[PDB]
PDB file of C-alpha atoms and ligand atoms in Angstrom:
ATOM      1  CA  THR A   1       2.577 -10.516   0.217  1.00  0.00           C
ATOM      2  CA  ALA A   2       4.359  -7.035   0.697  1.00  0.00           C
ATOM      3  CA  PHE A   3       2.920  -3.305   1.686  1.00  0.00           C
ATOM      4  CA  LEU A   4       4.084  -0.440   0.085  1.00  0.00           C
ATOM      5  CA  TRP A   5       2.925   3.194   1.150  1.00  0.00           C
ATOM      6  CA  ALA A   6       4.076   6.562   2.150  1.00  0.00           C
ATOM      7  CA  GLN A   7       4.380   8.224   5.671  1.00  0.00           C
ATOM      8  CA  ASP A   8       5.315  10.935   7.108  1.00  0.00           C
ATOM      9  CA  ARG A   9       7.095  11.350  10.952  1.00  0.00           C
ATOM     10  CA  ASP A  10       3.680  11.092  12.614  1.00  0.00           C
ATOM     11  CA  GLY A  11       3.357   7.716  10.559  1.00  0.00           C
ATOM     12  CA  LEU A  12       0.526   9.428   8.267  1.00  0.00           C
ATOM     13  CA  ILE A  13      -0.245   8.277   4.914  1.00  0.00           C
ATOM     14  CA  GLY A  14      -3.003  10.462   3.525  1.00  0.00           C
ATOM     15  CA  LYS A  15      -5.066  13.254   4.433  1.00  0.00           C
ATOM     16  CA  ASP A  16      -8.900  11.836   3.971  1.00  0.00           C
ATOM     17  CA  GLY A  17      -7.740  10.620   0.442  1.00  0.00           C
ATOM     18  CA  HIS A  18      -4.629   9.694  -0.178  1.00  0.00           C
ATOM     19  CA  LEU A  19      -0.852  11.015   0.223  1.00  0.00           C
ATOM     20  CA  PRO A  20      -1.194  14.986  -0.290  1.00  0.00           C
ATOM     21  CA  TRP A  21       2.689  14.825  -0.742  1.00  0.00           C
ATOM     22  CA  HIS A  22       4.415  15.527  -3.985  1.00  0.00           C
ATOM     23  CA  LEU A  23       6.676  12.615  -4.399  1.00  0.00           C
ATOM     24  CA  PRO A  24       7.675  11.831  -8.093  1.00  0.00           C
ATOM     25  CA  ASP A  25      10.311   9.318  -6.835  1.00  0.00           C
ATOM     26  CA  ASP A  26       7.797   7.210  -5.031  1.00  0.00           C
ATOM     27  CA  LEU A  27       5.246   7.086  -7.842  1.00  0.00           C
ATOM     28  CA  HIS A  28       8.285   6.457 -10.681  1.00  0.00           C
ATOM     29  CA  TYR A  29       9.416   3.491  -8.247  1.00  0.00           C
ATOM     30  CA  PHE A  30       5.888   2.786  -7.543  1.00  0.00           C
ATOM     31  CA  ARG A  31       4.849   1.781 -10.990  1.00  0.00           C
ATOM     32  CA  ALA A  32       8.440   0.432 -11.920  1.00  0.00           C
ATOM     33  CA  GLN A  33       7.803  -2.035  -9.298  1.00  0.00           C
ATOM     34  CA  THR A  34       4.170  -2.786  -9.775  1.00  0.00           C
ATOM     35  CA  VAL A  35       4.570  -3.051 -13.363  1.00  0.00           C
ATOM     36  CA  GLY A  36       3.140  -6.809 -14.240  1.00  0.00           C
ATOM     37  CA  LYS A  37       1.706  -7.628 -10.823  1.00  0.00           C
ATOM     38  CA  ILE A  38      -1.119  -7.388  -8.761  1.00  0.00           C
ATOM     39  CA  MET A  39      -1.953  -4.339  -6.260  1.00  0.00           C
ATOM     40  CA  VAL A  40      -4.474  -4.695  -3.626  1.00  0.00           C
ATOM     41  CA  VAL A  41      -6.515  -1.540  -2.967  1.00  0.00           C
ATOM     42  CA  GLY A  42      -9.271  -0.792  -0.230  1.00  0.00           C
ATOM     43  CA  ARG A  43     -12.963   0.482  -1.181  1.00  0.00           C
ATOM     44  CA  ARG A  44     -12.102   4.349  -0.797  1.00  0.00           C
ATOM     45  CA  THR A  45      -8.917   4.029  -2.578  1.00  0.00           C
ATOM     46  CA  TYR A  46     -10.408   2.876  -5.916  1.00  0.00           C
ATOM     47  CA  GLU A  47     -13.073   6.124  -5.361  1.00  0.00           C
ATOM     48  CA  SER A  48     -10.119   7.922  -3.909  1.00  0.00           C
ATOM     49  CA  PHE A  49      -7.300   7.247  -6.311  1.00  0.00           C
ATOM     50  CA  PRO A  50      -5.873   9.136  -8.851  1.00  0.00           C
ATOM     51  CA  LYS A  51      -4.962   6.531 -11.480  1.00  0.00           C
ATOM     52  CA  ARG A  52      -7.602   4.125 -11.203  1.00  0.00           C
ATOM     53  CA  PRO A  53      -7.202   1.420 -12.634  1.00  0.00           C
ATOM     54  CA  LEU A  54      -3.156   1.873 -12.919  1.00  0.00           C
ATOM     55  CA  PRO A  55      -1.815   1.851 -16.376  1.00  0.00           C
ATOM     56  CA  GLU A  56       0.574  -1.456 -17.500  1.00  0.00           C
ATOM     57  CA  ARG A  57      -0.427  -3.431 -14.231  1.00  0.00           C
ATOM     58  CA  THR A  58      -3.254  -5.408 -12.521  1.00  0.00           C
ATOM     59  CA  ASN A  59      -5.239  -3.575 -10.337  1.00  0.00           C
ATOM     60  CA  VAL A  60      -7.335  -5.280  -7.377  1.00  0.00           C
ATOM     61  CA  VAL A  61     -10.258  -3.610  -5.525  1.00  0.00           C
ATOM     62  CA  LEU A  62     -11.406  -4.811  -1.319  1.00  0.00           C
ATOM     63  CA  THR A  63     -14.898  -3.029  -0.959  1.00  0.00           C
ATOM     64  CA  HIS A  64     -17.424  -4.669   1.360  1.00  0.00           C
ATOM     65  CA  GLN A  65     -20.081  -4.094  -1.481  1.00  0.00           C
ATOM     66  CA  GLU A  66     -21.360  -7.355  -2.787  1.00  0.00           C
ATOM     67  CA  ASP A  67     -22.628  -5.784  -5.919  1.00  0.00           C
ATOM     68  CA  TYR A  68     -19.873  -3.515  -6.451  1.00  0.00           C
ATOM     69  CA  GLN A  69     -18.465  -3.647 -10.062  1.00  0.00           C
ATOM     70  CA  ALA A  70     -14.743  -2.383 -10.761  1.00  0.00           C
ATOM     71  CA  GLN A  71     -14.134  -2.415 -14.666  1.00  0.00           C
ATOM     72  CA  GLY A  72     -10.561  -2.904 -15.268  1.00  0.00           C
ATOM     73  CA  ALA A  73      -9.872  -4.317 -11.760  1.00  0.00           C
ATOM     74  CA  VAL A  74     -10.560  -7.502  -9.156  1.00  0.00           C
ATOM     75  CA  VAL A  75     -13.457  -7.438  -6.863  1.00  0.00           C
ATOM     76  CA  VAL A  76     -13.609  -9.271  -3.612  1.00  0.00           C
ATOM     77  CA  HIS A  77     -14.816  -8.236  -0.330  1.00  0.00           C
ATOM     78  CA  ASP A  78     -13.320 -11.106   2.141  1.00  0.00           C
ATOM     79  CA  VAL A  79      -9.553 -11.497   2.922  1.00  0.00           C
ATOM     80  CA  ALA A  80      -9.498 -15.174   2.234  1.00  0.00           C
ATOM     81  CA  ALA A  81     -11.532 -14.892  -1.150  1.00  0.00           C
ATOM     82  CA  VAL A  82      -8.710 -12.443  -2.691  1.00  0.00           C
ATOM     83  CA  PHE A  83      -6.124 -14.807  -1.121  1.00  0.00           C
ATOM     84  CA  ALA A  84      -7.484 -17.728  -3.386  1.00  0.00           C
ATOM     85  CA  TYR A  85      -7.204 -15.270  -6.492  1.00  0.00           C
ATOM     86  CA  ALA A  86      -3.583 -14.402  -5.543  1.00  0.00           C
ATOM     87  CA  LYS A  87      -2.836 -18.245  -5.440  1.00  0.00           C
ATOM     88  CA  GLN A  88      -4.369 -18.897  -8.915  1.00  0.00           C
ATOM     89  CA  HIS A  89      -2.272 -16.240  -9.829  1.00  0.00           C
ATOM     90  CA  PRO A  90       1.584 -17.656  -9.313  1.00  0.00           C
ATOM     91  CA  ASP A  91       2.927 -15.704 -12.138  1.00  0.00           C
ATOM     92  CA  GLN A  92       2.235 -12.246 -10.019  1.00  0.00           C
ATOM     93  CA  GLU A  93       2.944 -10.702  -6.924  1.00  0.00           C
ATOM     94  CA  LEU A  94       0.804  -9.367  -4.134  1.00  0.00           C
ATOM     95  CA  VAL A  95       1.320  -5.483  -3.417  1.00  0.00           C
ATOM     96  CA  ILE A  96      -0.842  -3.612  -0.922  1.00  0.00           C
ATOM     97  CA  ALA A  97      -1.082   0.062  -1.353  1.00  0.00           C
ATOM     98  CA  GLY A  98      -4.145   1.079   0.899  1.00  0.00           C
ATOM     99  CA  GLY A  99      -6.293   1.973   2.390  1.00  0.00           C
ATOM    100  CA  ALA A 100      -5.655   1.582   5.978  1.00  0.00           C
ATOM    101  CA  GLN A 101      -8.046  -0.834   6.845  1.00  0.00           C
ATOM    102  CA  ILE A 102      -6.673  -2.911   4.150  1.00  0.00           C
ATOM    103  CA  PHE A 103      -3.192  -3.254   5.650  1.00  0.00           C
ATOM    104  CA  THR A 104      -4.958  -4.247   8.790  1.00  0.00           C
ATOM    105  CA  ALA A 105      -6.658  -7.479   7.442  1.00  0.00           C
ATOM    106  CA  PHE A 106      -3.443  -8.302   5.744  1.00  0.00           C
ATOM    107  CA  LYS A 107      -1.164  -7.329   8.333  1.00  0.00           C
ATOM    108  CA  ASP A 108      -1.428 -10.340  10.278  1.00  0.00           C
ATOM    109  CA  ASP A 109      -1.459 -12.462   6.516  1.00  0.00           C
ATOM    110  CA  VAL A 110       1.302 -10.454   5.111  1.00  0.00           C
ATOM    111  CA  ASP A 111       5.154 -11.645   4.412  1.00  0.00           C
ATOM    112  CA  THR A 112       7.008  -8.540   3.530  1.00  0.00           C
ATOM    113  CA  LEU A 113       6.716  -5.112   4.134  1.00  0.00           C
ATOM    114  CA  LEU A 114       8.108  -1.970   2.344  1.00  0.00           C
ATOM    115  CA  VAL A 115       7.474   1.712   3.808  1.00  0.00           C
ATOM    116  CA  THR A 116       8.510   5.233   2.702  1.00  0.00           C
ATOM    117  CA  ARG A 117       8.932   7.148   6.008  1.00  0.00           C
ATOM    118  CA  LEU A 118       9.384  10.934   4.985  1.00  0.00           C
ATOM    119  CA  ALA A 119      11.015  13.299   6.831  1.00  0.00           C
ATOM    120  CA  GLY A 120       8.563  16.260   7.270  1.00  0.00           C
ATOM    121  CA  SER A 121       6.088  15.845   9.789  1.00  0.00           C
ATOM    122  CA  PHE A 122       2.711  16.126   8.480  1.00  0.00           C
ATOM    123  CA  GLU A 123      -0.784  16.467  10.226  1.00  0.00           C
ATOM    124  CA  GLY A 124      -3.962  14.437   8.887  1.00  0.00           C
ATOM    125  CA  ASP A 125      -7.014  12.146   9.906  1.00  0.00           C
ATOM    126  CA  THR A 126      -5.181   8.613   8.569  1.00  0.00           C
ATOM    127  CA  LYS A 127      -2.305   6.811  10.275  1.00  0.00           C
ATOM    128  CA  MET A 128      -0.762   3.641   9.671  1.00  0.00           C
ATOM    129  CA  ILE A 129      -1.942   0.536  11.810  1.00  0.00           C
ATOM    130  CA  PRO A 130       0.003  -1.497  14.378  1.00  0.00           C
ATOM    131  CA  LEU A 131       1.829  -4.543  13.097  1.00  0.00           C
ATOM    132  CA  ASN A 132       4.044  -7.674  14.522  1.00  0.00           C
ATOM    133  CA  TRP A 133       7.471  -5.875  14.197  1.00  0.00           C
ATOM    134  CA  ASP A 134       8.991  -8.510  15.972  1.00  0.00           C
ATOM    135  CA  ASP A 135       7.552 -11.411  13.710  1.00  0.00           C
ATOM    136  CA  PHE A 136       8.930  -9.288  10.939  1.00  0.00           C
ATOM    137  CA  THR A 137      12.969  -8.812  10.105  1.00  0.00           C
ATOM    138  CA  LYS A 138      13.979  -5.928   8.487  1.00  0.00           C
ATOM    139  CA  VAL A 139      15.547  -7.151   5.181  1.00  0.00           C
ATOM    140  CA  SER A 140      17.059  -3.887   3.680  1.00  0.00           C
ATOM    141  CA  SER A 141      16.996  -0.010   4.465  1.00  0.00           C
ATOM    142  CA  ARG A 142      17.966   3.151   2.076  1.00  0.00           C
ATOM    143  CA  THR A 143      17.765   6.593   3.138  1.00  0.00           C
ATOM    144  CA  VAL A 144      16.942   8.856   0.352  1.00  0.00           C
ATOM    145  CA  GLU A 145      16.992  12.494   0.513  1.00  0.00           C
ATOM    146  CA  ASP A 146      16.511  15.541  -2.205  1.00  0.00           C
ATOM    147  CA  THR A 147      17.268  19.111  -2.499  1.00  0.00           C
ATOM    148  CA  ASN A 148      14.313  19.711   0.051  1.00  0.00           C
ATOM    149  CA  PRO A 149      14.894  18.748   3.828  1.00  0.00           C
ATOM    150  CA  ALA A 150      11.306  17.737   3.486  1.00  0.00           C
ATOM    151  CA  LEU A 151      11.715  15.507   0.546  1.00  0.00           C
ATOM    152  CA  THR A 152      13.871  13.417   2.195  1.00  0.00           C
ATOM    153  CA  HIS A 153      12.302   9.539   2.369  1.00  0.00           C
ATOM    154  CA  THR A 154      13.909   6.204   3.738  1.00  0.00           C
ATOM    155  CA  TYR A 155      13.166   3.567   2.096  1.00  0.00           C
ATOM    156  CA  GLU A 156      12.798  -0.162   4.212  1.00  0.00           C
ATOM    157  CA  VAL A 157      12.248  -3.793   3.827  1.00  0.00           C
ATOM    158  CA  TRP A 158      10.848  -6.196   6.348  1.00  0.00           C
ATOM    159  CA  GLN A 159      10.431  -9.904   5.658  1.00  0.00           C
ATOM    160  CA  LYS A 160       8.647 -12.489   8.257  1.00  0.00           C
ATOM    161  CA  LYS A 161      11.042 -14.803   9.780  1.00  0.00           C
ATOM    162  CA  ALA A 162      11.166 -18.243   8.825  1.00  0.00           C
TER     163      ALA A 162
HETATM  164  N1  NDP B   1       0.218   7.118   1.348  1.00  0.00           N
HETATM  165  C1  NDP B   1      -0.594   6.094   0.552  1.00  0.00           C
HETATM  166  O1  NDP B   1      -0.360   5.545  -0.222  1.00  0.00           O
HETATM  167  C2  NDP B   1      -2.121   6.071   0.850  1.00  0.00           C
HETATM  168  C3  NDP B   1      -2.766   6.731   1.407  1.00  0.00           C
HETATM  169  N2  NDP B   1      -3.924   6.629   2.093  1.00  0.00           N
HETATM  170  C4  NDP B   1      -4.641   7.538   3.010  1.00  0.00           C
HETATM  171  O2  NDP B   1      -5.346   6.655   3.895  1.00  0.00           O
HETATM  172  C5  NDP B   1      -6.634   6.890   4.116  1.00  0.00           C
HETATM  173  C6  NDP B   1      -7.340   5.402   3.927  1.00  0.00           C
HETATM  174  O3  NDP B   1      -7.473   4.518   2.793  1.00  0.00           O
HETATM  175  P1  NDP B   1      -8.665   4.486   1.676  1.00  0.00           P
HETATM  176  O4  NDP B   1      -7.959   3.768   0.522  1.00  0.00           O
HETATM  177  O5  NDP B   1      -9.288   5.771   1.469  1.00  0.00           O
HETATM  178  O6  NDP B   1      -9.392   3.372   2.591  1.00  0.00           O
HETATM  179  P2  NDP B   1     -10.361   2.218   2.077  1.00  0.00           P
HETATM  180  O7  NDP B   1     -11.696   2.300   2.543  1.00  0.00           O
HETATM  181  O8  NDP B   1     -10.334   1.547   0.446  1.00  0.00           O
HETATM  182  O9  NDP B   1      -9.525   0.796   2.915  1.00  0.00           O
HETATM  183  C7  NDP B   1     -10.032   0.479   4.010  1.00  0.00           C
HETATM  184  C8  NDP B   1     -11.610   0.227   4.087  1.00  0.00           C
HETATM  185  O10 NDP B   1     -11.684  -1.022   3.106  1.00  0.00           O
HETATM  186  C9  NDP B   1     -12.657  -2.038   3.433  1.00  0.00           C
HETATM  187  N3  NDP B   1     -12.045  -3.001   3.700  1.00  0.00           N
HETATM  188  C10 NDP B   1     -10.837  -3.427   4.412  1.00  0.00           C
HETATM  189  N4  NDP B   1     -10.212  -4.360   4.347  1.00  0.00           N
HETATM  190  C11 NDP B   1     -11.292  -5.369   3.921  1.00  0.00           C
HETATM  191  C12 NDP B   1     -11.769  -6.649   4.001  1.00  0.00           C
HETATM  192  N5  NDP B   1     -11.072  -7.559   4.225  1.00  0.00           N
HETATM  193  N6  NDP B   1     -12.990  -6.996   3.577  1.00  0.00           N
HETATM  194  C13 NDP B   1     -13.926  -5.912   3.144  1.00  0.00           C
HETATM  195  N7  NDP B   1     -13.657  -4.739   3.252  1.00  0.00           N
HETATM  196  C14 NDP B   1     -12.454  -4.293   3.837  1.00  0.00           C
HETATM  197  C15 NDP B   1     -13.286  -1.203   4.898  1.00  0.00           C
HETATM  198  O11 NDP B   1     -14.281  -0.750   4.393  1.00  0.00           O
HETATM  199  P3  NDP B   1     -15.567   0.441   5.643  1.00  0.00           P
HETATM  200  O12 NDP B   1     -15.213  -0.233   6.635  1.00  0.00           O
HETATM  201  O13 NDP B   1     -15.655   1.453   4.641  1.00  0.00           O
HETATM  202  O14 NDP B   1     -16.845  -0.713   4.965  1.00  0.00           O
HETATM  203  C16 NDP B   1     -12.126  -0.461   5.262  1.00  0.00           C
HETATM  204  O15 NDP B   1     -12.865   0.639   5.949  1.00  0.00           O
HETATM  205  C17 NDP B   1      -7.237   7.407   2.636  1.00  0.00           C
HETATM  206  O16 NDP B   1      -8.214   8.144   2.817  1.00  0.00           O
HETATM  207  C18 NDP B   1      -5.685   8.532   2.521  1.00  0.00           C
HETATM  208  O17 NDP B   1      -5.716   9.478   3.281  1.00  0.00           O
HETATM  209  C19 NDP B   1      -4.995   5.910   1.043  1.00  0.00           C
HETATM  210  C20 NDP B   1      -4.245   5.075   0.099  1.00  0.00           C
HETATM  211  C21 NDP B   1      -3.210   5.255  -0.087  1.00  0.00           C
END
């Protein structure tokens, strides 16, 4: 149960759809890590995603709609439901990409955290959700910088104690 998403100084993530910043290093590493695994995505995501479903990977959709049909990915509407699936898949890992409400649900049921804090300060209508930082301990931290001062990101890891 790990979360993977991009954000700015304001903690942003998207602009009424998704990350509007061109982060090639994020995508490349994103797919390089989500290879042969399972990624959970929100409703607005599957519809507001540029790569739906993601190639060479296992996609997972999370929408309230009961009659929702997501071809190529797994469909569910409850937090407990999808959890049963993840259990049935002991050969894969859980990776949350979006949306904001999705991270919230697992926010409590989460174990690992992976965030990319950009350097530039952007403004939108979608910010990250609160998390129990105390209950989570930083596993790793790497500050990556590019030619552009705004293209500088920081990769941080977090794992719940015990
Ligand atoms: N930087 C990034 O990687 C990403 C950034 N973003 C940004 O964040 C914004 C929000 O994410 P987006 O993908 O659009 O949002 P989603 O609608 O996909 O995710 C949140 C919504 O999913 C539904 N949902 C969440 N948890 C559950 C649950 N346990 N059971 C059932 N339904 C659930 C709810 O639907 P509702 O309440 O609609 O009924 C909730 O409002 C995007 O518009 C974009 O700007 C989005 C994706 C990735």
